[PDB]
Design a protein around this ligand. Structure first.
Ligand SMILES: Cc1ccc(/C=C/C(=O)O)cc1
Lengths: 271, 9
């Protein structure tokens, strides 16, 4: 019984519907996510062979162990919906709200956050999972630990090496090859969205808002940003996908060296 | 200038 294992509390947000909760077994804070079956586009199967939403499949593939990824702790099927029990860090703020309240982040802090997002996306790819909706809204900050957590795999897919022709993520983080041709490859599309994200951290908002800006290939910097960081951003936002860096090249980039540890990040920047 | 969220889809 899902209704006997968890004390349900306040709506955290929707747009399915996510409630704050506590596991009765040990007072663990959880988030309880409800998704209507009728509104599910992609379906998959688990080892049991049970037909589940792809989001459930992808969450199980990445939830093994510790990571900068939200952990699926359990799920339930109901007549017209599935219910997901997820980790809930506390205290938490998502990265969109954090940037809204603080403005453009110092490069030292953006370096630490971006690095942690890179490690989490690498973890997804190692587990066979393509997130397809990397953005500040889908990143939680554990304000006490200084750790970032990637959330919302509802638009993701199994990672493959052949072309993708479907996409249901965030258009302003999608690459020009999707805007123009309705096609993209997984890793290079991920790298594009990471360039959008990095710009967003060091400038205080995403660079592009309209299709013509996405395909236009011009990055104007609205804040003071170091030349090394501008170079990395422009490299991630290369118009041709094959011109974009790999994850190894991002993490070897000179702007990325000497990152802060998560605990240092919390103490210097979040406490 | 207006900074806003963007829905997925
Ligand atoms: C505060 C909080 C908010 C959201 C989640 C998870 C959401 C998802 O995976 O879509 C977890 C914690």
């Amino acid at each position: 019984p899902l209704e006997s294992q968890y004390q349900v509390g306040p709506l955290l947000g929707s747009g399915g519907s996510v409630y704050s909760g506590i596991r009765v077994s040990d007072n663990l804070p959880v988030a309880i996510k409800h998704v209507e079956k009728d509104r599910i586009s992609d379906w998959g199967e688990l080892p049991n062979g049970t037909r589940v939403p792809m989001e459930v499949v992808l969450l199980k593939k990445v939830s093994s162990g510790f990571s900068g990824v939200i952990r699926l702790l359990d799920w339930f099927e109901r007549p017209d919906s599935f219910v997901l029990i997820l980790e809930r860090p506390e205290p938490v703020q998502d990265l969109f709200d954090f940037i809204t309240e603080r403005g453009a982040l110092q490069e030292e802090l953006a370096r630490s956050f971006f690095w942690q997002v890179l490690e989490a996306v690498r973890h997804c790819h190692n587990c066979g999972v393509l997130h397809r909706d990397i953005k500040d809204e889908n990143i939680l900050i554990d304000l006490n630990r200084g750790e970032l957590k990637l959330i919302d795999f509802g638009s993701g897919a199994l990672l493959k090496d052949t072309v993708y022709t479907d996409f249901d993520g965030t258009r302003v983080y999608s690459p020009p090859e999707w805007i123009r041709y309705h096609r993209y490859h997984g890793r290079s599309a991920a790298v594009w969205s990471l360039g959008i994200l990095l710009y967003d951290m060091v400038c205080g908002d995403i660079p592009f808002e309209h299709d013509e800006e996405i395909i236009g290939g011009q990055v104007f910097f609205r804040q003071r940003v170091s030349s090394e960081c501008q170079h990395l951003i422009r490299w991630c936002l290369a118009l041709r996908p094959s011109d974009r860096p790999t994850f190894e090249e991002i993490q070897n980039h000179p702007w990325m060296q000497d990152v802060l540890l998560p605990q240092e990040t919390a103490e210097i920047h979040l406490h | 200038r207006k900074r806003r969220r963007h829905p997925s889809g």
